[PDB]
Amino acid sequence: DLNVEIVAVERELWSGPATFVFTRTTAGEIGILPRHIPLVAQLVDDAMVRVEREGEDDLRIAVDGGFLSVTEETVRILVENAQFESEIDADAAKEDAASDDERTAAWGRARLRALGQI
Amino acid sequence: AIHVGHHTLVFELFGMTFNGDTILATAVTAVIVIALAFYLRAKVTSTGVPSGVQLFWEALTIQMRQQIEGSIGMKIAPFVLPLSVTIFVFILISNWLAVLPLQYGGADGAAAELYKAPASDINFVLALALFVFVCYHAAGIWRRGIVGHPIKVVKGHVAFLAPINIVEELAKPISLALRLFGNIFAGGILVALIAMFPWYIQWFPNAVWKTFDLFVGLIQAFIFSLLTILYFSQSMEL
Amino acid sequence: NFLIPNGTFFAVLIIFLIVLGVISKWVVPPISKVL
Amino acid sequence: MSIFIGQLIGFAVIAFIIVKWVVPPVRTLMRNQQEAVRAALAESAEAAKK
Amino acid sequence: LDPNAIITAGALIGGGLIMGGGAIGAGIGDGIAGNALISGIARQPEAQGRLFTPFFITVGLVEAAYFINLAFMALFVFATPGLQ
Amino acid sequence: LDPNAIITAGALIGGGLIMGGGAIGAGIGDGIAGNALISGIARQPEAQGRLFTPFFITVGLVEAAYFINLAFMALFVFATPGLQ
Amino acid sequence: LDPNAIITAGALIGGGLIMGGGAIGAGIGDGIAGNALISGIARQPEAQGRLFTPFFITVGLVEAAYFINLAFMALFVFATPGLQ
Amino acid sequence: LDPNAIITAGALIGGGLIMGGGAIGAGIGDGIAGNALISGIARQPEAQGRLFTPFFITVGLVEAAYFINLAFMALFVFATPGLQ
Amino acid sequence: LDPNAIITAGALIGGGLIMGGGAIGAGIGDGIAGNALISGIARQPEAQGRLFTPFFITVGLVEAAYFINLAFMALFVFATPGLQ
Amino acid sequence: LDPNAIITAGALIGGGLIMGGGAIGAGIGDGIAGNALISGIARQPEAQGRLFTPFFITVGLVEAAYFINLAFMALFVFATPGLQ
Amino acid sequence: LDPNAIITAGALIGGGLIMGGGAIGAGIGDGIAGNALISGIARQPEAQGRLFTPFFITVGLVEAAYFINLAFMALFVFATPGLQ
Amino acid sequence: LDPNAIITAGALIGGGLIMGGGAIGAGIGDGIAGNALISGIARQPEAQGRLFTPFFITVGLVEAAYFINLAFMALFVFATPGLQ
Amino acid sequence: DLDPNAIITAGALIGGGLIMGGGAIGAGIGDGIAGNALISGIARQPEAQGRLFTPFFITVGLVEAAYFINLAFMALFVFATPGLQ
């Protein structure tokens, strides 16, 4: 198990042991296991994060301004903003998707991906 | 039959043979170049709108000057700017004039050409390569001294690889010539092969080959010019 | 044989020289001045 | 002279391809450069007048 | 038994070797240079402007190994050395 | 044993070599250039349009070499030099 | 020796070389283009839909060369030039 | 010398070339595709299954290519063209 | 000269080519697959168990070809096709 | 001009091919595996303990191919099949 | 048969081998070095002069090997050792 | 012709092929291992001290191959098996 | 009779040609790969060129060594041909 800690600018969002972390950096999709080598990658503009933990359904997090950092024993995602799946509104993301602002579109697409609508 | 290496107007003077076809091709190319030069000079406008010929010449000059400055100080080697550029245009014309439809029958079925690119004659490429070799070796002598320049070149970038440097130097001239030679020699041969086909089969492959040979000739002139500038910069340092 | 160098080696060379003269006195210096 | 006819047809095809595809873009580039230099001259004259 | 026959057979084999080796080298080198050029152009568009300069140089250094050999092929196939 | 038989055999061998080398070079160069293009398109989709330009230059060289071989092999087999 | 025997032996050897080179080039180039496509799919699965457009073009030519070679091999072992 | 003897010797050498090239191509291409698949899985293990469909294509197109050679080698060494 | 002598010499040459190509292909494929596996293990050690699932396939599909070559080698060097 | 002499010459050529192909494959595969290992150790100086295992597996496969070729070349040269 | 004919045919084949290997090596090495140079230029626009010197060292070594082959092939063909 | 004459001709050609393959393998493999070592030193200067440990082993596994081939040259040339 | 000396000479010449082909391929491609590594290193670390020369040459050394070894053996094949009668 690896200590995942999603941390926002304003506060610390969530932490705990997990079994696997799936995200999407600028290069491409990436999966992090307990003993992944050190890494410092920028999450894609519309990145989403899936955390697979023991004895609990996968956590889907919509992320804004992510910056994944993998250490020998920790994984920290630095999100300018975040939203758990329970807190995302499908209607809001669908309506605001593909707006005149690129960052708004990225956040809406991250919300959609977290919802699994894709 | 193809009969590679054939020549016409071959004659002798001073007890030395001359290939008339190569002389005629080179004379035609030089005449075209000089006509373009004088057309520019007559109609060169520093203030008014420049004509197409002026655009062409200034583009060539700008490119050559850019490479010269990047590789070496432009102020250090002014004479490189003309030499380089002229080579380019020379070779370029020497190749592009081959596009003209001058392929006919020699009464034996073998293709005969009124104009063959001089590069297909080893003498032309050898002359150009040896001329550039002597030019930049003399420039290296000038900028490093009569004895220093050989010392530096044999020493090279790293001293204890002196033997390779020797070969390196000998690689520069011949590599410059043969490369160009082949790039044209193939074409000089290749068209003849298509000439074995009938007209209704010769039109298409010849068309495609010459369409690509235009680009080949342009690329080869460019390569030779940049390699000449590169060797000049290499031989004139410190 | 064809690769063997011939006398024309000099003749073509001579032509090249005069081309330089045309490009070093009527094309390149004026163009540099213009630019 | 059948090969002469074939190579003449090939040259005609090459010239047609050139005029159809290559000549227009290079003509556009020449026109762009001519217009750019003309605009530079006009703007310099306007700046001197100003 | 007609020695020139063996001479020309050996010359044809040699020219085949010339062309095969040269073509392999040229194809591989040009493909590698093109891969470099395409990747560089993918990295940023503007870089293309300066990429064609070294790229062509690479091609100039690559195709030579082909065409140099090409010349020898003709020397082998048409003006066969030691043809007797 | 007519010498022209030996000449034709040697020419066929030379053509086989020429085609083998040309095929190897063309195939591998095409593979490398296409790998570069595919990776570029995968990474930046909006680069698609600007990637097909350099690629076709690379092919324009690679394939060209192949064609040259294709011609010379013919010269070997259909116009065997020195057949006499 | 029957001259046709030497002719056909040489032609069959040439066809063997043609197959060898064509297969080498096809296999290597197709594997490289594949590697590229698989890397694109793994890195960015969304690219899959648009990745077939370049890839099949790349592989599309890779086979062509090989297939072209194949044709000439049929010419060598069925219509051997110079056969008597 | 029996003509069929030399003809069949040439056929055997040609088949040897055919399989040599085919095995080389298959090995290189399969290894490269496997490298791509292994790297992709290493970067994203859960993508494993999704990568089999693309992978099987290139392998199914590389290995398949090699198989053609096998078939033709039969024609070379079991029904030899121009076998007197 | 006994025709079977020429037949056996050609067969031995053919088998030598079989193994040359097969060993080259197998060695290069194993090297490339091993490079991919080593890189993956270095990157994601805990994925090792998963990474062996595709690796064994690729090797299992590369060496296969090599072993296939071995088979036909015997057919060349032990039961020579076309032998008299 | 003993048939044994021709068969032995063919066997020697075949064995030379065995060794050449095996050496090429072994050298290149070992170099590639070592490149992977070196990169892994440079990036992770503490990972050599677990990196040596896949590297050893790859080297084992490559050397197995090389030694199989060695054994078959010995079979050729020392006990030539088909020789009378 | 003429001993000189056999000697010079062998010389021509050996020279073809020398030049084929030299061309393959030179082309591939120049391509790889040019790929390195082009990648460096794309990454760093201003590293042009700095990247000249090592690229020229590499190309110098490659062309030195190539022209050593050229000199030795010229020796082989024009002044063949053991020519009696 | 003396049987030992053709025996020794075949032996010379086989040894030449053995050394050709060995040289190709050694050069390619050690060049790749070098590339690895230079890259590692560029990324981690101090790691040089430890990087020489795996590198040598790699070179060993490559160099050994070449040297083994070298030995067989003697076994092929100075003491040709099957000579009579 | 075919003058066995000619057979030996042809075989030795072909063997030397094969030796050169292999040696040149190996040396050229290995030098190209090592130079690629050196160029990339200098591009990434402009001030490391000297530090890069030490390993680079070492690698190149061994590469060239193989070539030179082949060279030596070719000198035996063409001039001091073994097995001559």
Numbering used by the authors:
A (entry chain H): 3 to 120
B (entry chain a): 10 to 247
C (entry chain b): 23 to 57
D (entry chain d): 1 to 50
E (entry chain O), F (entry chain N), G (entry chain M), H (entry chain L), I (entry chain T), J (entry chain S), ...: 3 to 86
M (entry chain Q): 2 to 86
Sentences reproduced from the published study:
Extensive classification of the data for the mycobacterial ATP synthase revealed the presence of not only the three main states referred to as S1, S2, and S3 but also of substates within them. Substates S1a to S1e are in S1, and S3a to S3c are in S3. Further round from S1b by ca. 2° lie S1c to S1e, which have similar c-ring positions to each other, but there are large differences in the F1 domain and in the PS. The positions of the top of the PS suggest that the order of procession is S1a > S1b > S1e > S1d > S1c. The main differences between the substates within each state are that the positions of the PS and F1 domains vary such that the F1-domain (including the α-helical coiled-coil of the γ-subunit) appears to pivot around the PS during the catalytic cycle. However, alignment of the substates via the “crown” in the F1-domain shows that they have identical nucleotide occupancies and that the position of the γ-subunit is also maintained. Each nucleotide binding site in the three α-subunits and in subunit βTP is occupied by an ATP molecule with an accompanying Mg2+ ion, while the site in subunit βDP has ADP and an accompanying Mg2+ ion. The sixth nucleotide binding site in subunit βE contains an ADP molecule with neither accompanying Mg2+ nor phosphate. During rotation through S1 in either direction, the γ-subunit approaches very close to the PS at b′Arg72, and potentially a salt bridge could form between this residue and either γAsp170 or γAsp171. Unlike the tether, which can be formed in any of S1 to S3, this feature can form only in S1, when, during rotation, the γ-subunit comes sufficiently close to the PS for a salt bridge to form.
The membrane domain of the mycobacterial ATP synthase is embedded in the IPM, with the catalytic F1-domain of the enzyme extending into the bacterial cytoplasm and attached to the membrane domain by a central stalk and a peripheral stalk (PS). As do other ATP synthases in eubacteria, chloroplasts, and mitochondria, the enzyme couples a proton-motive force (pmf) across the IPM generated by respiration to the synthesis in the F1-domain of the enzyme of ATP from adenosine diphosphate (ADP) and phosphate by a mechanical rotary mechanism. The mycobacterial rotor consists of a membrane-bound ring of nine c-subunits, attached to an elongated central stalk, made of single copies of the γ- and ε-subunits. The mycobacterial PS is made of two proteins, bδ and b′.
